[PDB]
Design a protein around this ligand. Sequence first.
Ligand code: CL
Ligand code: CL
Length: 421
Amino acid sequence: KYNCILNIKYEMDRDKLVDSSGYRSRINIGTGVKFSEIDKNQVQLSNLESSKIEVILNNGVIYNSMYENFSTSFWIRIPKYFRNINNEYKIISCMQNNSGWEVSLNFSNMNSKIIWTLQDTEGIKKTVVFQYTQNINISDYINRWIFVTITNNRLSNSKIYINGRLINEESISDLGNIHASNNIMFKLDGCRDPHRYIWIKYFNLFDKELNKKEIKDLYDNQSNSGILKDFWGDYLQYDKPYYMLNLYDPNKYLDVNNVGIRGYMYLKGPRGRIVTTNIYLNSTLYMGTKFIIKKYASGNKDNIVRNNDRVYINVVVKNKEYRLATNASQAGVEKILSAVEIPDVGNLSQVVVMKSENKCKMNLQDNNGNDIGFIGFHQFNNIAKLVASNWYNRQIGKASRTFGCSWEFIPVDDGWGESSL
Ligand SMILES: [Cl-]
Ligand SMILES: [Cl-]
């Protein structure tokens, strides 16, 4: 759909990235490309000569035009910058004889930038920029998967959409003929920092200007909404430790008062800060008590957490794992949660239904499969204790805001460095 003229997608039969658009453009993958073992569409391009992908376009879809509209879309994940770049570097190039289109990255004045450049055969350039600050407590963008869509209307504007939403437009109507290349080079080109890399997936080209609705539907269809995601946007997994971010108070972190059914877990603050003047100023994410999601009812062989999976939650306390559990017979709607010894869980409630996209992800069950409530928090004499509460289940269908039950799961990731765990 959408006049797609290139659709880079992993194919099991040939066991490689191929063009699935129907035009059979050849995809040459360098030896220095790395792939995710969990999602084989995710590819990592590092700052090495062999870490490159080259597309040899079907000769009928090469762009050589003054008036034809075209669009591109892709997902990208860019590590946090710890050093000034001021050093714009290419990542996706379709240029010949100084004409064509190009995606480049830069980091300047605490802003990470994604730059779209068009250049016509008279040498006239137009650029459109998406940028985001590194001076921010918790970013929607730093080191997290971003869905990018760039549309080009030769009569008027080039537009950048980010996660399905128009965020910038620049006039391109004065550009003349644009004669782009026979091939597309995916490769960090001109980057002076040897540690830089990117992750990318699902690169597409379209020979029209996509509209708002097509882009939102593209964002949704490529989102894999049946699979829960961690904070970085990767697949949520079993047997993987996660730090917990509560979106209703993000400046707090999780702690355990004591283990055992008489103890409780609670949110304390403030979150720390990781700071270097004129480079970054962020809240620390690798803090507090870790959760590990454990398989219960799911029979899938793989370690991917899916919508409506029934799981156990283990809690890590001084390098030892306990079970998140509660006695559903305690008084009140709010059931205070405990970290109990795994052999001693007995008949305490412990089964959690995981829910993908609000963002309330954990619905605790009793052993009749009845809802005890989403896991959130509640104030008990100025202590914000962790609770399962059916108040959430009655409420999150009424409004569309953040609730105390809205969480993100944060694993340690190479693209986000901190001193303390
Ligand atoms: Cl169009
Ligand atoms: Cl999710």
